[PDB]
Structure 1
């Protein structure tokens, strides 16, 4: 895999685990959407687009002793398809702080990561509720 090239960073497994926690726990607090919209997946890193059905039509339900009908299907009004954008924000960690951690043991302040996590989750909510014109999404 290794697009997420965490081997090349200096941060040790503890510093990664604390960055991941400081991201996840900031997402959990910040997001409104995942409180009312259920997650699908995660699908995988490589999936660029999803085909999905629109079930915009109401239809009857079958009720019989035995099952002698076939009209009681659900059929997609259309198979739409949507591309998955990237939401991203970047933060620096100054090299001195890594040196302080690795020698003195004064640990990395991951709040830069948590602030990036917030500025991404805010955009995720903005995309979900308001859509996005230029990606051609709808919300």
Structure 2
């Protein structure tokens, strides 16, 4: 006639609401991937597969007096569908803490929730920026056709601008230009954030004006690398099946462990808008 048992959801309504709010907000704080990209809307739990379009196209538009160009852009052989993985963590909550938060001291502590959701989002950003060979996925710094360009010039007072200038030139060489967005590793970003370039102000302001979609920081990237991409759709996408949400796994010895879910898959529909070291 009390808490003991293997019953269904232990948490009351408001406690569930607080858990969901915490995971959502810490996700919003900790996600850098979902700002440079843009998401195909939430398809739902059921959708396990999404189309994965073929590759580049060097076919541009044309203008004639009477439309006769026929403007072909056709996928060739297959469509090679792919599947949407899942990412998760744990919520080992004590039963005595829940019991105390009912008739006693009652700031129900969900610190483990924020920690686990932060770890989950970190793993997800690792997925976007680096595919895993076990599932055979593609990562931005390990894709095919990255259009590499050396850097070899930082640690100088102003030897960082020309690297992104060259990257933009190479990216426009493939006839693929637009609002660029840059993501950099932590130490590289801080080093870029240094004193005046001797020709004005902090370099990041000029780089941000050149990119036109911001320069972002990612701890999850390797030590000395970074990327610049074309933020528009028709080039890259983030297929989402369901956003971060906490669900009840089961009953432990007597505790309650939870698990945070989100199903994401990047689609590089055009591996021409990627540039790296």
- TM-score class, shorter-chain normalisation, is 0.7 to 0.9
Query: Which has a greater percent of strand?
Result: 2
1:74 matched residue in structure 2: 73
Let me know the Cα RMSD of the aligned residues: 1.9
2:103 matched residue in structure 1: 103
Stretch moving more, 77-86 or 52-61: 77-86
Aligned residues of 1:89 and 1:119 also touching (Cα < 8 A): yes
Residues in 2 aligned to 1:132 and 1:55: alpha-carbon distance in whole angstroms? 20
Correspondence list, 1:48-127, <5 A: 48-70=48-70, 72-76=71-75, 79-104=79-104, 106-127=106-127
2:203 matched residue in structure 1: none
SS of 2:67 mapped into structure 1? coil
Residues in 2 aligned to 1:124 and 1:25: alpha-carbon distance in whole angstroms? 16
> Number of aligned pairs?
132
Correspondence list, 1:4-83, <5 A: 8-70=8-70, 72-76=71-75, 79-83=79-83
Query: Which has a greater percent of helix?
Result: 1
Query: Unmatched 5+ residue regions in structure 1?
Result: 1-6
TM-score by length of 2: 0.44
Structure 1 residue 125, shift from structure 2 partner: 0.7
2:222 matched residue in structure 1: none
Residues in 2 aligned to 1:105 and 1:74: alpha-carbon distance in whole angstroms? 65
Structure 1 residue 66, shift from structure 2 partner: 4.2
Query: Unmatched 5+ residue regions in structure 2?
Result: 1-6, 140-277
Residues in 1 aligned to 2:68 and 2:89: alpha-carbon distance in whole angstroms? 57
Structure 1 residue 96, shift from structure 2 partner: 1.1
Deviations 1:50-100 (A, max 9, x none): 122134111021323443342x13323552321111111111111111111
